[PDB]
Each structure stands twice: as structure tokens, then as C-alpha cells.
Amino acid sequence: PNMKIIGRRIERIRNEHAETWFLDENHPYRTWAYHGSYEAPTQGSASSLVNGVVRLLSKPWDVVTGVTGIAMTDTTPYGQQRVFKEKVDTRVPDPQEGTRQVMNIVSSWLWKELGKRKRPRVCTKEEFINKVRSGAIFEEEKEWKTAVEAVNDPRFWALVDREREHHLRGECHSCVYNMMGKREKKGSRAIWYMWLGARFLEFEALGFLNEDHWMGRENSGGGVEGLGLQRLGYILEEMNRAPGGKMYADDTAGWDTRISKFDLENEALITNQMEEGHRTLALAVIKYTYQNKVVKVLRPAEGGKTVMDIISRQDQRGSGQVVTYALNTFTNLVVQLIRNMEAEEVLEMQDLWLLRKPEKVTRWLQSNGWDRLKRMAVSGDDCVVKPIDDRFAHALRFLNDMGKVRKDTQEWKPSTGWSNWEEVPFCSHHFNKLYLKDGRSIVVPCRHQDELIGRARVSPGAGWSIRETACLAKSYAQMWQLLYFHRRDLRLMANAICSAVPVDWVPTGRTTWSIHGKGEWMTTEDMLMVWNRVWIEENDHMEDKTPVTKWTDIPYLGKREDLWCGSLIGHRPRTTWAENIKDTVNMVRRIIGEKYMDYL
Amino acid sequence: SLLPVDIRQYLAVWIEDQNWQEAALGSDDSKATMLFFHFLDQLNQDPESLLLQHNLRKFCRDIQPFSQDPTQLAEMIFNLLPVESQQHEIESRILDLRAMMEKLVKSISQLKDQQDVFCFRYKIQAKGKTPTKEQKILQETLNELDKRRKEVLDASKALLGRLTTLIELLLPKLEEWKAQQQKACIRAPIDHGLEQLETWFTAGAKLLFHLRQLLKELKGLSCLVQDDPLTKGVDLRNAQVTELLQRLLHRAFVVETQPCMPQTPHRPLILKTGSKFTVRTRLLVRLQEGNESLTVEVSIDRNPPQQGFRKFNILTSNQKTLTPEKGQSQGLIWDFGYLTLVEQRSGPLGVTEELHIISFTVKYTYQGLKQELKTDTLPVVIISNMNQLSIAWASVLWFNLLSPNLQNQQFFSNPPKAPWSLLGPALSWQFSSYVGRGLNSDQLSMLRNKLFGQNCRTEDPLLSWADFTKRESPPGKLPFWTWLDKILELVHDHLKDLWNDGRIMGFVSRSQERRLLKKTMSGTFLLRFSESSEGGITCSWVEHQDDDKVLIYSVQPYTKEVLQSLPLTEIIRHYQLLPENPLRFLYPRIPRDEAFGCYYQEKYLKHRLIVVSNRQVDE
Numbered sequence A: 001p002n003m004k005i006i007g008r009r010i011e012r013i014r015n016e017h018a019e020t021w022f023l024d025e026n027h028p029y030r031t032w033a034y035h036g037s038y039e040a041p042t043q044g045s046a047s048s049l050v051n052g053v054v055r056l057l058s059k060p061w062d063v064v065t066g067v068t069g070i071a072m073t074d075t076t077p078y079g080q081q082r083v084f085k086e087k088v089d090t091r092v093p094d095p096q097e098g099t100r101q102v103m104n105i106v107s108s109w110l111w112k113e114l115g116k117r118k119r120p121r122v123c124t125k126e127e128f129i130n131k132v133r134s135g136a137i138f139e140e141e142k143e144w145k146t147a148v149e150a151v152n153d154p155r156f157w158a159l160v161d162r163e164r165e166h167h168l169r170g171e172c173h174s175c176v177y178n179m180m181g182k183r184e185k186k187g188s189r190a191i192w193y194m195w196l197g198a199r200f201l202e203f204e205a206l207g208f209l210n211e212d213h214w215m216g217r218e219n220s221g222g223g224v225e226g227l228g229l230q231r232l233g234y235i236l237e238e239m240n241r242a243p244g245g246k247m248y249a250d251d252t253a254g255w256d257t258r259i260s261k262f263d264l265e266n267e268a269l270i271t272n273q274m275e276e277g278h279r280t281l282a283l284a285v286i287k288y289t290y291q292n293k294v295v296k297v298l299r300p301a302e303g304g305k306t307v308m309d310i311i312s313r314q315d316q317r318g319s320g321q322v323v324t325y326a327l328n329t330f331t332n333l334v335v336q337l338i339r340n341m342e343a344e345e346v347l348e349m350q351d352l353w354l355l356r357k358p359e360k361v362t363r364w365l366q367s368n369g370w371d372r373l374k375r376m377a378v379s380g381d382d383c384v385v386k387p388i389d390d391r392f393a394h395a396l397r398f399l400n401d402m403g404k405v406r407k408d409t410q411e412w413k414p415s416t417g418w419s420n421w422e423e424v425p426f427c428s429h430h431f432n433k434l435y436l437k438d439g440r441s442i443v444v445p446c447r448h449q450d451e452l453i454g455r456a457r458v459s460p461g462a463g464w465s466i467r468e469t470a471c472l473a474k475s476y477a478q479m480w481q482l483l484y485f486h487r488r489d490l491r492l493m494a495n496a497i498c499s500a501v502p503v504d505w506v507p508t509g510r511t512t513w514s515i516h517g518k519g520e521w522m523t524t525e526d527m528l529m530v531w532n533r534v535w536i537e538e539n540d541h542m543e544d545k546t547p548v549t550k551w552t553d554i555p556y557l558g559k560r561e562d563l564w565c566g567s568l569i570g571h572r573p574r575t576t577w578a579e580n581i582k583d584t585v586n587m588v589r590r591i592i593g594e595k596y597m598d599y600l
Numbered sequence B: 001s002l003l004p005v006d007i008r009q010y011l012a013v014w015i016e017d018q019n020w021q022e023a024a025l026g027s028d029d030s031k032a033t034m035l036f037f038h039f040l041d042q043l044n045q046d047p048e049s050l051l052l053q054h055n056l057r058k059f060c061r062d063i064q065p066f067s068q069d070p071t072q073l074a075e076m077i078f079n080l081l082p083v084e085s086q087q088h089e090i091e092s093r094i095l096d097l098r099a100m101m102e103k104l105v106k107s108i109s110q111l112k113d114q115q116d117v118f119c120f121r122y123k124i125q126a127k128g129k130t131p132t133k134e135q136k137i138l139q140e141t142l143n144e145l146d147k148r149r150k151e152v153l154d155a156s157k158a159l160l161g162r163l164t165t166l167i168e169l170l171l172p173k174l175e176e177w178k179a180q181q182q183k184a185c186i187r188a189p190i191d192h193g194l195e196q197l198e199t200w201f202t203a204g205a206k207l208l209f210h211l212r213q214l215l216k217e218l219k220g221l222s223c224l225v226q227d228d229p230l231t232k233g234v235d236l237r238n239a240q241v242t243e244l245l246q247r248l249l250h251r252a253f254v255v256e257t258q259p260c261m262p263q264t265p266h267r268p269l270i271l272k273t274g275s276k277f278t279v280r281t282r283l284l285v286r287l288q289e290g291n292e293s294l295t296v297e298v299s300i301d302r303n304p305p306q307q308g309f310r311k312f313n314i315l316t317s318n319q320k321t322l323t324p325e326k327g328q329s330q331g332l333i334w335d336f337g338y339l340t341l342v343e344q345r346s347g348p349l350g351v352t353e354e355l356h357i358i359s360f361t362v363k364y365t366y367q368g369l370k371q372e373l374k375t376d377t378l379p380v381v382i383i384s385n386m387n388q389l390s391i392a393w394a395s396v397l398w399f400n401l402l403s404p405n406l407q408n409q410q411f412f413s414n415p416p417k418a419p420w421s422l423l424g425p426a427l428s429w430q431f432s433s434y435v436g437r438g439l440n441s442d443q444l445s446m447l448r449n450k451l452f453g454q455n456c457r458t459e460d461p462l463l464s465w466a467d468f469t470k471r472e473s474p475p476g477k478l479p480f481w482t483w484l485d486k487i488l489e490l491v492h493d494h495l496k497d498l499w500n501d502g503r504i505m506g507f508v509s510r511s512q513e514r515r516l517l518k519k520t521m522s523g524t525f526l527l528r529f530s531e532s533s534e535g536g537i538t539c540s541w542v543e544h545q546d547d548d549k550v551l552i553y554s555v556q557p558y559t560k561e562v563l564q565s566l567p568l569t570e571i572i573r574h575y576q577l578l579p580e581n582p583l584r585f586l587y588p589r590i591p592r593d594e595a596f597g598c599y600y601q602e603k604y605l606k607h608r609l610i611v612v613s614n615r616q617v618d619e
């Protein structure tokens, strides 16, 4: 641990809680750096808060574990500590010298290519004031109520300017991570995010990657940033058109945990395209926040009390960084390019040890690199590539030496590619091509019903009040109307929830967490008008812009595929539920107020 | 309280105003979830007093898992809303396991639906043309089903334990009631009834049969589509519930009303040949199939002693049939009237000293469960003529007061002695039941002196059976029991109202009579029962004629032969001895016309004398 970088932060958060400060000798941290602890109040729950409207309108699914076990997440310090020990407290072996050399070459080439048409720039306060939504989770004595309140206050910006001057003077006294673990059942994730000011420093330093769409498909060829779930299927099919082998959608087991010091090292190469003051700011953010970081994580202690530990690490990646998605997409693009080169025999096994003829890597990149980029869609850690042949399946040496081991696959077993582009997983979804009554085609996202309903049953706990629950249920219903209309039960639940919730209201937020959920369903506008605007009017893949007439004219996808993706039609409880849908919607209209429109 | 719900006082109005009991469960979980939402809405002085403001938050998170089972939170709110305490324990345990039964029914109802969704989603996967990762998700929900059914088995076992404890409490209560009925037959003043035991036994039986039904439903569901151990577990639970059901139904069949001739309601268990009698059996498990009637069959002396013991058969019929409608109207009861007994034309114990036992058998059936229930009455004595009715009753008492074993027909071949602590209160019970008043300590001590003597230095003396029925009482020509029984008959037939209002001393010794009549005015008289004549009341008044003399006159005892045509109140009213009435005051100091005036209706004898010298008594 380089104490000259994190020492001031450690001492400040120690002086914040000096009465209970102590150095535990029984900490379970093996790969991180322990610096002390202090008693803190317990937080979270053994299970998430369940929405009332969803549970009462999804009576049959109360029995299937697919929508119940998803809400059985314990954010208690015991579960957080277990998730930390299993998922985060790991150590990635450093890649070999030739591997790091190839990584550096490909990363420099990609940073130059993404900057052939773009130039890094500063990010002002006004941009950040816009992007903030109705987090402001503070970590030190200067605390607020919400982010929209703190962002409009001058004392917050003065407190941020102080830390900016510290970054300019080579010090750092406020940018501290706060880790919240989440245990499932499975896919238990840890969440990092600093307070609003540290994230604004991140923003002003590096947010041009997001605001200027540096990872957009136009400028990156392989990225998909900006596109909603209503266009990624088109991207996948246009990839399917190109020649080559199968399409591969491998997933990295704990991608954030596997990013090495060399990944951050090669991502910091973008500092060579920034102006000197911008370079000072961004290098400060990188070396005081990304390559050296202190986190605060709760851990159960004796006597029922919970104790927060102050921990430190260098070579990993957090979750709630302002630009974590862009850098993840960049590193994944580099990974896929390296694996493509290994598949095409450009990169052999001896180049792992020490790259003898580096020109072979550059020449390829200049002759073929961009093409390979067009044959891939990368959204952060998720990716789908279409190589020139199926050798990609067994090009694993450079992938494993970089530590990007594949999820749910033996280390040295060839990957499995999808021959049907309508079955490939991308952003937790597959994409199906269905036809309207006009014979016109529409590629549309779809996923399993159980997860789609369980994610609709949860509540953040800050929306405990009934009004919040009702508005969030309307949000989920209209999201289904826009994105999952092709599903029978989701169409029924949407037309039921929108009829149970008062029409004049506005939906809450949080339907999905993927950057591809643009949120066109957060409006009181007629949902058929929104559907036509998204799928026909503003759809660049729809030529004949003739509109539709009503949801009765909207095509469900085939019954067989629906049943395969978790549908329940034909089930006796499902049919009784559909029959008593009127009874249940009217009984749900009650205990609220108001149901001013009947959508059935 | 182990569960954490602190400072209920802040939102006390809210919690107190709430509908927790209604939200405990119901047709719609929606009311419980509404209580949840508005409860949270509510959950939203000095800061030192607002320290619990943080504690609130903890609770507000602790009940977050209750948003999955809202009836659980509403149930927390609703449940949080001495000689015989065993009754309360019985009723509370019954209510507890009824609530547990509702919870188990809900568990089964949702497990059936989970197995149905498993089949509905396994059909599709089997119809898939690929016959692999989603197969393991299907196996995961299968493992969830396995855990759920293990939980159901554990819940059934937890129900079986409490039901076993309930039966182990219920059966001793029934045996206590049997002993109390045994005492009540021999005229003890006990108010009882099988209604409460009926409710208890019937609750237990209803819940046992309900569990027996749920196990079958479970097994049929469990197979889905004997590979699962749920078959073996359900079979074991079913064997156990059937064992408990048989153990309960074994004793659920009892004799509600012992056999008693209607001619003599006061004295049960004495039966004359040819005279019909009335028995009544009751099945405490008020569960009857609405399509089939229940028939009880009667027998006499199933295990007769193998000794000069007379045989007896039943005239007319030995059956009572109960249709389900009547069984609903009056409960599962078979009331035998018109039951007559007749000897089969073909030792040291007398005719009234041999005992007979009347048995009853039913073939009970409910929800497929069949069992033969058998029960028999208290032992009975069969007389040839009503002139035995008295002495035969002495056989009933002596048994029902001292027989440990009720299956002992050889009781009088070696009869035990009756202690006074038991016999005295029984002699009181006889009068108490048959006539208005019982026997107080003075008359009881008089009878004790008459039976054992004033010398007896043993506490609670033992009276021989021979000294109670066969040995004569010294002062008269009648054994003790026959004499006291004729006194009881005399009181009931000719002295009922006099004995009720306490105008009769009844049982005073001659010496105690003199001692009481010494220190009183001339003209004071007692009414005492004659120890020499059979069923006779005598009157004795004292007179002082000299400074040293105290004469005690007495009348020749009045029997039924005189009191049938001339009541005693009229004799006291007009004694007219040669001619002023010598009966001036009733003891202690009540005017003769005042103590008997209310019995006087609008519109000879012989005397005896015993002289008490004042000074020779004063020595």
C-alpha cells in the first residue's frame, strides 16, 4: 500500500470516528489492505421490499420460485461480508510480459482510433447538474438530503473545489468508496460508489467518454452505447449478415474483479490526448481513485453490533464510477481484438512470454482491426462477437493469461457459439424477429418471464409509501408495453396495472438498471403513440412508416417460444387469474383511491 | 417479548385502532398488505427522547421480509393483540393446533400449485427437441419442492406431538368424570355432564380426521409426474394419526346414564326381572357419516364368573339404531328404554350380593375409518321382588363407595370395610338427594356413636359389611342400614317439610337427649327417630316437678300406621294430655304453635317416663 496516497483519507475517516476506532486482528481480508475499523449502525435487510401492486396482480407467480428467490436478497452485513469474501477478495495473477505488451499495443491503437475523429475535453458543472436525478450519499461530516438539493447549493461546490485543489496539489482527502454487498439465492454483486463530489470530479475528468459518445457504435464500431433495447437486435442481425463462424457471447466471471493493474495502466493511456490541465485533473482521478482506492465495508461483530472496516486496494474496478461503463467497454474491446488475433493465428503461444515481432500486431490492427470491431457488439462486460471463423472457440491462451476467464465454462474448454442470432444472449436478453400484419419485420428484445416479474416485484425501500409503489408499478407496466408487448402475461399485467393506477399520475423510476433502458415509458403520453414513435416513426430500420391502430393489432410472439421463455398461458391458475383479472383489478383500485381508465 | 416491537406507545393509537384480528388471515391477503403499507406510512420532544428515532428504522427494515408474507406481520399484531386450570389448557391447546391446522392447509394448498407449475414447465422441456443448462434450473425448483415437502412433514410431526399431548390430557379427564359419576349414582350432590368432554373429544377427533385427509391428499399430489420419500413419510404420519385416532375412539364410547328403573329414579343399578329400565350410552366423538346409521348392541354378563352365578338374558331387543339426522339433532346418543331382563330357567352370596355387568358394542365408522367400540356399565344387582329394593341398595353403596376395581363381580365374597370418612358423607348424601336436608355433624356423630361406640379411640373407624346390613342394631330389632332406610322412607313420605325446615333433631342419643333437656323450661320437647321401633318418630318433652327431679316423658313412636291418617303436626298441635297440652316449646325456645303453625290445616297414645335426678347428674 502506497500510504503517501491514501494516508490522509484513512486518517480523516479515522478522526471522523475516533471514539470507537480500533485495529481488529481478526479481519478476514487476505487480498486487500486493512487499515482499521469502527462501530456503525446496522443497515439493509435479509430480504428486499416487495411491491404490493405486483404481488396482488401476480398471484400465480407467488408459487414459482423464479419470481420469489430474486427478491430474497440479504443486504445485511453478514451477507455483504460473505459476498465480499467470495467475489471481491480475490487476487488475479499478473499476465506474462508478452501478454502485457500485446495489451499495451492494442489499447494504444484503440485509444488512437476512438480519437481519430474526437478530442478529449473538460466537463463543466452544467452537464453534471443536468445528469443528476431525484444519490447524494455522503461519507463525511458534510451531509445532505438528496442529490438534486445538494447540486443546487454553493457550499457543495465549494467543498468539491477544495478537493479539486487537493488533486492539483497532489493530495486527496475526500474521494472514498462505500461498498454495499448484495447476496442472492448466485449472482451476488458488490456495489461501489463514492459521494456526489468525488463522482463529480470523476465526471469533469473523464465523462467526455460518455457525453461525447466515445463508446458509441458510430465512433467505436464495436460499442453500442446509446442504443436502447429496441435496436440491439438489429445490431445483432446485421452482425449475422457478415461472413464468418458462429456468434460468440461469452461472459467473464466477475469482470470488475478481474481488471488488473495493467488494464487500468492501458486505459490511462488516453491521458496522452488531453490538454495539460485536463491531464493533471484526470491523472489525479486515475491514480488517487482508480489505481489506489480506499473503501468502507460493513462486517458483523460481537454483541450484535456491526463494525465498518476501512479497506484498500489498487487493481480492481468499482461499480458506480461515472465512467466505469466506458472503460469496461474499452477493455472488453481490447480483449476481443486480442482473442481474434489469437484465433487467426496472428498471435501464437510464444508471444505470451515475450512478443518478438510486435509489427505483426500493428499490421493486423491497421489492415483488419477496424473490420473486427464492426463484427462485435460490446456493452461493458457483455459482448457478442462474430469472428472470421470458428477458431475463435479455442483461442483461449491470451484470454486466460489476461485473467478474463469465462463464466460457466471450464478454463481450457472451447466456447460454444450460437448459430441462430435470435438465441444469442446480449444484455440479459435475446432478440426475436417477428412480423406485423403488414408483413413488415420488427426485431424486439425478450427474456425469461420469472426474472422480468421478480425485478418488477422489488422496491428500493425509499418508495415504501403506497404512492411510490403505485407509480413504480405503472412504470414497469408501461416498460412492458413498450418492450415486452409480445408476451401474453406481460401484456395482460401491463393493461391491468395501468388500469389499476390512476391515469393522471406520473411513474417513479428504476425499472431497469441497464444503460439500454432509455425510459420512454416514464411519460403519461398515450403508450400506443410512444410505441409508434419508438418502433415505427423514429425507427431507422422501419421503412414504411405506416402506424399501427391498437394493441389488439400488436403481434404477440409465437405461443411455443413464449411458453419456452417462461410463459404460463394454458395453466389453470393462469386462466383463473385472467378470468378474475377484473375482480382483482377492482380490488386493487381499492386501498388507493383511483383507476380512471379501464384498459381491458 | 423476544420479538422486537418497541415503543408501541408512539403509534399506540394506530396499532390499537387497527384491524389485526381481521387481518390475521382472510379471503384476501390484500387487507394485510394494506395494513402493511399504511403501517409504514405511520412509521415515517428533545433529540435525547428521539434516540429511538433510530431504533424505529431498524424495525422498519426488520419487517421487510414480512412484505413477502404479510399475513405473518398481521399475525404478529393479532396474536400480540385455581383448582382446575386444566380446562383452560385444553381449550388453549385446541385453539393453538387449530391455527396450526389452518397454516398446514395453506402450506399444502400452495405446495400443490408449485408441483403443478413444475409439471407444466417440465412438459414443455420434455417436448423440446434437444433431448441443457435450464434443466438444472428445473432441478433447482425440484430441490425447492423437496425442501418444502420436508418442511410439511416436520409440520405434520409437530402437529402430532401436540395432539398426542392433548389426548394424554383428555383421557384422564374422562376417567375423573367416570369416578364422579360413580359417586353421583349413590346420591352424591354432583352436577356433571358429557357436553364439555363431548366438545373436547370432538375437537380432537375432527382435527385428527382432518390431518388423516390431508396426508392422503398430499400423497396423491406428491407423486406428481413412490420415488420420493414423501410416500414413506406420509405413510408413517398416517400410521401415527391412525394410532392416536384409535386410542381416542377406544374410550370415546361411555355410558352417559347408568341403568335405572323408571319406577325408582332415586336408586340406580337395582333391576327387577320383568320390569323395564333405562340406560343411555353416548359417543363423545360427535362425528357421524350422514348416509349410514349407527347401531348399538346390548349384552349381559359377557364374562360371567366361572360358581352358582345366576344366568340372565334379555327380553325384547338388544339394539338401538341412530339415524344421522337424529345423531345431528341430539348428538351420538343411544337411549335404551323398554329394556327388560329375564332369568334363564335352569352359593354363599345372597341374591342381592351378586353383581351383573351390562355391555354395549358399536361398529363405528367415519371417513373410511372403522372400529369396534365396547363399553360396559357399573355392576348391577337383580332382584325378584321390590321388597329387596332396600337391602339391595346397601349393595350398591358399598361397591360404589369402596370398590377399586369396577370389574369385580366377586365383591361381596370378601367385602372390605367402609371407613367413616367415606360412609358418613354417603349417609348424608342419601338424605340430601332424596329429601330436602342432609345430615349435619351432630346427627352424623350420633350415628357414629351408634355404629362404633363412644370408646372408639381410632380415627376414621372401619365398619364391617356384616355390621352394616346383617348384624342387628342393639336398641331395636333392625340392622343399621335397614333402620336408617326406614327412617329415610318415613321422612320422605310423612315428614318431608318438617325435616326440610329443621324442626326435627332426628338422631340424638337418649343420654344426649337428657343432657340437652336438663337445662330448659318445662314443656320443651324433641322429635327424634326411634332406635327401637322400625321407621318411627318419637316425641320427648321434659318436665321439672321437684327441686331435684327432671322427668323426661316420651311418646310411643309414631309409624306409618298412624301418620297416614293423622299428620305429626296435628298431633303436636292437639296432644291434649290430661287437660293442657304438655308440648309448650320446641327446643331450644320456639313456641309450639309457632314452630308448626304454617303446617297447620284448618278443621289415643301411650307415654314412657325417664327420671333424671338433678344432683346425681350434677355429680
Ligand SMILES: [Zn+2]
Pocket (backbone or CB within 6 Å): A163, A167, A171, A172, A173, A174, A175, A198, A288
Ligand atoms: Zn479526492
Ligand SMILES: [Zn+2]
Pocket (backbone or CB within 6 Å): A430, A446, A447, A448, A561, A565
Ligand atoms: Zn424470449
